[model samples]
Target: ATTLTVDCRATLRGVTHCASGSLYGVTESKPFDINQFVAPLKPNVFTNPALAGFNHQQPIGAAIPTAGRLKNTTGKVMIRLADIFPRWPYGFTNMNDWLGKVTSVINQKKASGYSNFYGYEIWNEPDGTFKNNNVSFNDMWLQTYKLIRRLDPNSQIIGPSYSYYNHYNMNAFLNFCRANNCLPDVICWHELGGSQNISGNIRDLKTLERSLGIPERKIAINEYSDSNHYAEGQPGASAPFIAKFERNKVDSACISWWWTNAPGRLGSLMASDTQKGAGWWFYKWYGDMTGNMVNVIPQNDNSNLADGFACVDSNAKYISVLLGGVNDGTVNVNIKNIPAFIGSSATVKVEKVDWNGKDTPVNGTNTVFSKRYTVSNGTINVSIPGTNNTSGYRVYVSRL
Candidate 1:
């Protein structure tokens, strides 16, 4: 049996529910209703972006009003500027022509006069997209940064958006930015690797910051999850990323955009029918939490398998837990700090949401365990279950 401990007494910070965001997850006003099931997810930053004419879901013309719709929800819009390049890095007369597109975008933004944007990701995955482009990325960054700054000094910039977290490359990019005084307001990267890499990635980034004498900045994982076959559509395996992102305090993380151009797709969280999937359940529980996040520690802390995260909503008088990972193994969850309001006893309800196919419609979870127990040292331990790498367990502790 694996042991996982949660310290309800040790509070970290107010929960912004930052990890439940998405990339190109919202587009168009008619078919895209931000209040559908999305209301329950408490979605964070929405990367409402698409290249100028790249068969992408989001259109530059639509993003302005689309972001306006997002104001009704619990999120902000992160616009990927310079999405003007239709092709990869192919066919550009020269640097001037390339900058022309960005300048044109600038003119449009100025015309719209939208000021409530969260962050402007100058370009997405430039490390990969800058293939044969004749211009130096540093020079491009400086130029674009200057142009956008002139457009409006209020909008925050986010990037050097690489597909993966390359410390050397990121450091060099930031080194140049620091020298030129154009460091992005929010640092961003994509997470297409296993969720296990999340913690190490953040630690290394922090180390790099200290070495470069750069103060900590907001982190935006512009895209997350591996390819379409692995963690892309899986629920249980995706929990590790959420748990780590929340614990590490990543400012925002959008669920991946593998299929960036689905007409009515809602990332990995929903089906085409707009029905909620198992993956959406984990995020729903996370969204439902409206209080400070407590300390969560697994005894081994070695594997992404069998990990979990929990939050305490004293106002609601309940403790909510979202727990699971790549492996189908049982974990003994030790929840602490039973509120005095709940007396010395608590009733724990555990529901397991087993993962099905990505497109399969699913309704709810299976109630595997529910029991009332007296508190012991302000703690209660429950045995969480296992599935074929498909089940994500949700636990709620409350007064009987």
Candidate 2:
């Protein structure tokens, strides 16, 4: 029996924070510190326990002076107006002097107070010059979206980034941002290599947001990875792409490229410059998870071998299940509905992470394995011993 189920009154979404990124080794070499690589990801960093936010590109004109030490523990700071244009065989042939140097670095990072920087992306992919400069990339993205809505009129602009997912160039950039109204409050793309899928490209951007009638925008893959599997600090290659972007609620970044390559092949989640890897503890177990997201059915879900993800904290009395790949040894974890106060006794802890021969692995010192189990009625059937396929596990139930 190789089960793994959980219903807890089905509700397949809502438990976001989709593991963010873009801190690829602060600055290659030499005391170029961003609080020594963001102080070990402070008060909850990447280990895939749903890391909230991060994304940078600043420095084309200057402004990332460590952007005010990530002002209050970073949780959304996407700001990449394509490194302030001008690089590719001389691009941006003067669109009002490149929107006045991109609104003078967004009014000097909103007058240095950094103004809780969240969104502003506009140009990153532009569908490879849309078939020979499609109307000068839609008139340079509608004059840089009206000069960033006339300088931060409540920020947020993400856009035609798309380096992948080409539904006819995303329906011709959402019908040219709805006939030049400059739409794009958030809907970026890019899911690099490994023949992409990431939940079938966010369900084809929710069927192109109901065939472009709009109202449902907010989605950002920003950039992703697989780069030939398991090198982004391996946990059987970052917990099945962070459990398929948290079962496709959408919100990701994780690309880090190369902070220091080779070991198990670094693409990044901080392997050196102050530890935390194996994909940074899978995002620190999705940042110690919390609640809502309930429903994990893995009786092979199209077998990349094995997979699983279940949650339940918020007065349901803590339950967090996260299994991955697993070659096959024991495998048998039922766990259905499970919340009638977890009767018949319970304790489970088990935390394993394998692949010790190296190439990356080793950050939070892999838990190896722990024990305790015995619940009935609401259901609980355990087994999970020495799983294989590159190994990974994290079961934590409680009550007793």
Candidate 3:
């Protein structure tokens, strides 16, 4: 069974979309708070079905108390203070006394035994933006964690959820937390592109775990994808696929329902009629994108590309080859290790997508040459392709 997850980003909006705005539920006059936004949507127990799962719902930006002057409570409806403000110590001005009320919402969720919502990533990609002012990673984690602990002690506190591969903040924050013995329950990180830079992401996560003396197991990627750094364009990894992927890749068990349910957004899994966007149907085509990394091989000691898959469906003759990047060149691919039972006479199709957004199937190739693949030393050796201008590709091999 695949473990699926969803983001209730539009929960507080009262409705998913606001007429035609990109914002979930904003109007000319009012914008709802995070808790109120998410307080309504009943968790989907059907759709994809919660075979087994995790919550990728918490938004660090939405959860953290707005650092500026508080807003008037006159029209502030839904979501309490403790659940939203995250227990920061800044003195409340008469302008906004909403901080203390966040706890009520937290208690409400906790009392219901919603343990499946295991992680509360205080904010999203907080390490960027000069406007962050004095909000350091240390300050954010310490205060939000304190608040969460006071409320939902059962759920793990995962944070400082840095943007991209900014391990500097991750390294510094974890070290500070360790030195102060104030580490969050789990350290969360984000990344774009399962592209070449992804190796850096994986490596950085390991580095953070080691630097902070935390177990590698205690890490989660609340938002991640191969969206070519923009965090937009074509949806990187689809929702259903991502869910299944996390189900199999237990080392880091979390999904980034990042913008999955963003009301009227194109990248959302569910389509919005008003937005006229595509629903997340690509997951059906790439369902195998999720799963355990059964193997990895560094093509060359110096070049950093590796090849592997999250899961393999041999009956369907499906195999997902993870092509890593060190230098751009057509390096030979070797399926070093796979079951011996699968037929060698399979029809292999190689699809290449470069950084320039060019995608084309390698058509008219000699089937014999393509199928003449080898696996040795638990790896394969075939002319692996690369380009200085592009990131990498996935070779889909299917049975004849």
Candidate 4:
């Protein structure tokens, strides 16, 4: 039995859907009912393009003019400077020129006093770009971190922002930062392989921090998703992303920039400029979660066969489960505690939000199971079949 378990009473970490943050998917907040949709994902962070007036680089700029749009959607905004600068250092010109542009941008936003502006992410997958530059990447990061603080004393300094986690690089970067007194305010890196790697990466990250005798800082997977996962309208693409993120409690994450031509569609949650894609349904379910994010365990987490997350919204008088897997088969969910608020008998409903293609619309859902169960033992075992590795599954149990 692929036994998955959920304890409605275990609300230890709670749930902000921390890692659910999406990147560059919404240049404008209004189109595609984005705000209508994103407001529910309960995302903790977001990143926008370019700064106001200065559209020299990215499409939008959270540094000034349009940061307000970000605030309307998320609590934190990690302005992606990689997009603002035409090309980061070596990619464009010289180190001096890069610093000059960086300085200019900081001066430009100094006066705006934007609220909910999380901080500045110094770079993006910034490894090979430094090959021709005389300065080492670490020195450059220290320089930029110092420069940002000099210009904006109250702001935050984030990143070496690599594309993926490398134990040696992570340690090397931190060792230098600690020696030079420029440790990043938040540790960040990208995880594009699969969400299954989350626990291990964080495991090593924590170990590295301990070896260096440094305190753990907030973390962010600012850019994530593999080619296999991106641009797909299926739960298989996002389930474990949410499963591992919520389960491990990643501080924040932004879905990768897959649909650049159609940015700001909630990482392709929208089929087009206005229609809702099948991918959108899963997030809608994720956003629907309230009250408390309960505890859930995938029996053979190492197997990585099937995984899911659940919550109990006492005030809303409902329980919601969002689950999916990498392969087709059967997975069992053992839901514990049919809280007294739900009455002695509960109505169980299981619905699967399936794929209709990444770009096609799916306005409704498919219900696979519905029944009334007596809550005498405070445990309910659910069997969800007809599984599609590319689709998302949702379970709802409400007060009778």
lDDT (Cα atoms) of all candidates against the true structure? 0.73, 0.58, 0.36, 0.72
Q: Tell me the spans in candidate 1 whose CA falls farther than 4 Å from its real position.
A: 29-31, 50-62, 89-94, 110-116, 227-230, 260-264, 299-302
lDDT of 4 by residue, 1-400 (tens): 4557888877846657775666765564434454666676666777665352344455443445445565566546776666655544425455687678788778766666667776888876776445656676776788788888888778777787786788998988899989999988878888776666776888898899999999988887777664575533356667766777677667787777666567666677777777788877788778767777877887645434567888888778898888876654776778887688877777889888777566787787788888997776888888877676777888798976
Best by lDDT: 1
Q: Who is ahead in TM-score, 3 or 4? A: 4
lDDT of 1 by residue, 113-161 (tens): 6554676787778788765567777887898899779876877899987
Better of 2 and 4 by TM-score: 4
C-alpha RMSD for every candidate: 2.5, 17.1, 12.9, 2.8
The TM-score ranking, best first, is 1, 4, 3, 2
lDDT, model 2: 0.58
Q: Which 10 successive residues of model 2 have the least lDDT summed?
A: 44-53
Model 3 per-residue lDDT tens digits across residues 89-163: 322222123224334446554554423343454544556521333455465456656777777676666565566
How many clashes show up in model 1? 0
What lDDT is reached at residue 108 by model 1?
A: 64
TM-score of 2: 0.34
Over all chains combined, what TM-score does candidate 4 have? 0.89
- Which residue segments of model 3 deviate by more than 4 Å? 1-101, 111-115, 129-140, 164-168, 192-196, 225-282, 289-292, 296-310, 313-318, 322-333, 347-400
